[PDB]
Every structure is written in structure tokens, then in C-alpha cells.
UniProtKB/Swiss-Prot annotation:
Lineage: Eukaryota, Metazoa, Chordata, Craniata, Vertebrata
Impact after mutating D285A: Activity is higher than wild-type
Effect of K317T: Reduces the association with HDL particles
Protein family according to the UniProt entry: Belongs to the AB hydrolase superfamily. Lipase family.
Localization in the cell: Secreted, Extracellular space
Tissue: Plasma. Secreted by macrophages (at protein level).
Gene Ontology terms describing biological process: lipid oxidation; low-density lipoprotein particle remodeling; peptide hormone processing; phosphatidylcholine catabolic process; plasma lipoprotein particle oxidation; platelet activating factor catabolic process; platelet activating factor metabolic process; positive regulation of inflammatory response
Official protein name in the record: Platelet-activating factor acetylhydrolase
């Protein structure tokens, strides 16, 4: 793998939680501070149906699914699969929301970095038909046999794009809120039968969460999800929207977000109709920060920026002019300073306070669109 290891002092583990087993239950990948750093063996894209889903998203046919699976089917991401939770402290929690055509495992560079700095991160899989694929179980017996029911991205007609994208962002916000409720309930002793049979005992999460230090983070469709979630759910104390795609949001949302909100944009994705909606969030009674990463494209926030070499990266728009490792470091470090500021963490993340103001060779303060 070329997906970077976490830069923080904690070793990082990974597992999957589905509860309840149904299409209305919560599904998330958990990245967390590990007790042991035994081996970096987590499978990046762990089922073949996700390659079929990716293929349908990219508008290709049956054959490209099998090529992507041949290329990436065994690629790992640097986290200890089912490693025990590091005991004796309460961790801040991030709920993470993926963009259109993605699913829970494709922001491991972001999730492993936050975990290596002492966060638990819950990367949610959406059941809104925005994921390229996702699964659930029709009953408890199906969950015991591993007899998965698959759900693939919904292709939309232009006529319905406004209505359905707004219905999707509302469901997505409900899913971020449900996932938070699952983790907080486990933190306070709710017994849960994970619908997946994994060596990670969810009991370990008992009294492991710092309940006042909760953030929501998301990319693209996920950035819109950040804003919807903040508007509905004051348990989320701040939001970080990575290249927010603002189109799905209703105008009622902009006046309802008291929490601090951070926009981290790619230089090469943003456009005036998008930026104006970001600027409708600004108000002298609210904390809003915006930076742009110089030489970055949309995909610099996701794991596919690390999946290919420099030249094929640029050809496919998975990489920009900036180094993929340098982009994600600026994103993760800026995020850490912001989470230290607005969650009241007692760490050294304030060293990167300058990246929040866009003070780096590789950052623009605010936006090039200005």
C-alpha cells in the first residue's frame, strides 16, 4: 500500500460495526487508537460488489469491475485489523461521511491519521443509494450466515436531482446522528450483537468516549452532510467540510448552525455557485474558516489519490500538481488544529493553528473564487 501511515504517536486499529442488521440500521468502519502495533493488514476494499458498484458509478460496464478488483482487491490500508482498543483514556469522536460513489473504507488516509492522534472515527456507510454499493441483512439468520443484500448507487434524471439530492442529504444527516447514538449507547453499556462476526469485542468501547468532544467531518456530498447534521444535532460541537458540494442543501439550513464550521477546499474543484452557498454560512456571531490547498483536485481528499502512480494519477484526476502525501498532511494537520480549538483538546495540535489561516506555501487563505 501507498496509503500513508498515521503521523500521530498512537498505533491504529480498524474494525466494522453494523447494528441493527437491517437497511435502517447503522453501518460504520471504526478507526481507533490500538494497544498493539502488530501488523498493518486491514483490507482497503473488502468485497467484490464494491468494485461492481464503483464500475457502475464511473459509467463503465462489467469488465472494468474485474480489472479494478484485479488491481486493488488485495490492497491493504495501514491499520491493525481487530486490534484491541488502547485502554485507560476517553477519546474524542469523529463521525465521517463519504461522498457520492464512495463508501465507508475510502477515507482511511483521513481516518487512520485522526486515530493515530488519539481519536475514534466512525466512517458511516450511507443507505441513501449515494454509496457506489452497500449491504445489509434481511433478518438475523441472514446476518449469522453472512447472506448479504446489496444496494447500488441510484442514477438520477436531471428533473429529480433537486428533490432527491435534498432527500438524500436529510437521510445522510439522520445516519450520522444514528451512528453517534449507537456509539454513545455502547459507551454507556448498551449490549449490542454486531451483525458481523469479527474478533473485536464491542464491550471494549464501554466508557471509551469523551462525550463532550464530538465532531462531524465529510467530503463532497459528505461536506453537505456535515452542514445538515450540525443544523439538526447539537451533540456535534463542530464540523469540517472537505470540498463541500453544497447543491443538496435547503436555504433553511444556512441560519441554523451555531457550531464552528471549517471548509477545506481543493484549488481545482470549486466554482462560484458552490462558494456563494459556503459564504451564506458566514455571520459575525459564528466561527467560519476557509482554506484552499494549492495544486489539489477533488480526489486529493480520498484514498484513490494514493492508488496509482504520479502520471496515471494526473491522467485520471486522482492527483493534482501537489504531492498527494503533502495535500492530505495539510488537510489532516489543519483539521487537528481546528478540532483542538473547538473541542478543547489538551494536545499540541495548536502548532498548526497557522494552517487554519491558510499560512503555508501550499495553502490559500479562503478561496481563489474570491
Amino acid at each position: 500500500t501507498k496509503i500513508p501511515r498515521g503521523n500521530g504517536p498512537y498505533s491504529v486499529g480498524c474494525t466494522d460495526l453494523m447494528f441493527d442488521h437491517t437497511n435502517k440500521g447503522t453501518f460504520l468502519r471504526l478507526y481507533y487508537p490500538s494497544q498493539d502495533n502488530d501488523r498493518l493488514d486491514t483490507l482497503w476494499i473488502p468485497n467484490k460488489e464494491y468494485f461492481w458498484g464503483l464500475s457502475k458509478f464511473l459509467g463503465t460496464h462489467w469488465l472494468m469491475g474485474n480489472i479494478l478488483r484485479l488491481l486493488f482487491g488485495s490492497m491493504t490500508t495501514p491499520a491493525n485489523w481487530n486490534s484491541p482498543l488502547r485502554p485507560g483514556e476517553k477519546y474524542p469522536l469523529v463521525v465521517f461521511s463519504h461522498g457520492l460513489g464512495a463508501f465507508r473504507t475510502l477515507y482511511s488516509a483521513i481516518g487512520i491519521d485522526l486515530a493515530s492522534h488519539g481519536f475514534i472515527v466512525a466512517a458511516v456507510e450511507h443507505r441513501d443509494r449515494s454509496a457506489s454499493a452497500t449491504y445489509y441483512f434481511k433478518d438475523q439468520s441472514a446476518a449469522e450466515i453472512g447472506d448479504k443484500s446489496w444496494l447500488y448507487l441510484r442514477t438520477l434524471k436531471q428533473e429529480e436531482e433537486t428533490h432527491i439530492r435534498n432527500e438524500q442529504v436529510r437521510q445522510r444527516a439522520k445516519e450520522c446522528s444514528q451512528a453517534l447514538s449507537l456509539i454513545l449507547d455502547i459507551d454507556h453499556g448498551k449490549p449490542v450483537k454486531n451483525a458481523l462476526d469479527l474478533k473485536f469485542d464491542m464491550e471494549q468501547l464501554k466508557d471509551s468516549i469523551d462525550r463532550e468532544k464530538i465532531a462531524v467531518i465529510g467530503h463532497s456530498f459528505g461536506g453537505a452532510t456535515v452542514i445538515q447534521t450540525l443544523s439538526e444535532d447539537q451533540r456535534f460541537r463542530c464540523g469540517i467540510a472537505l470540498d463541500a458540494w453544497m447543491f443538496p442543501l435547503g436555504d433553511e439550513v444556512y441560519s441554523r448552525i451555531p457550531q464552528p464550521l471549517f471548509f477545506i477546499n481543493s484549488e481545482y474543484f470549486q466554482y462560484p455557485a458552490n462558494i456563494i452557498k459556503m459564504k451564506k454560512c458566514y455571520s459575525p456571531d459564528k466561527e467560519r474558516k476557509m482554506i484552499t490547498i494549492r495544486g489539489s483536485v477533488h480526489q486529493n481528499f480520498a484514498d484513490f489519490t494514493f492508488a496509482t502512480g504520479k502520471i496515471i494519477g494526473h491522467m485520471l484526476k486522482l492527483k493534482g500538481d501537489i504531492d498527494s502525501n503533502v495535500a492530505i498532511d495539510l488537510s489532516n494537520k489543519a483539521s487537528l488544529a481546528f478540532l483542538q480549538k473547538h473541542l478543547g483538546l489538551h494536545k499540541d495540535f495548536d502548532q498548526w493553528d497557522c494552517l487554519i489561516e491558510g499560512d503555508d506555501e501550499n495553502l490559500i487563505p479562503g478561496t481563489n473564487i474570491n
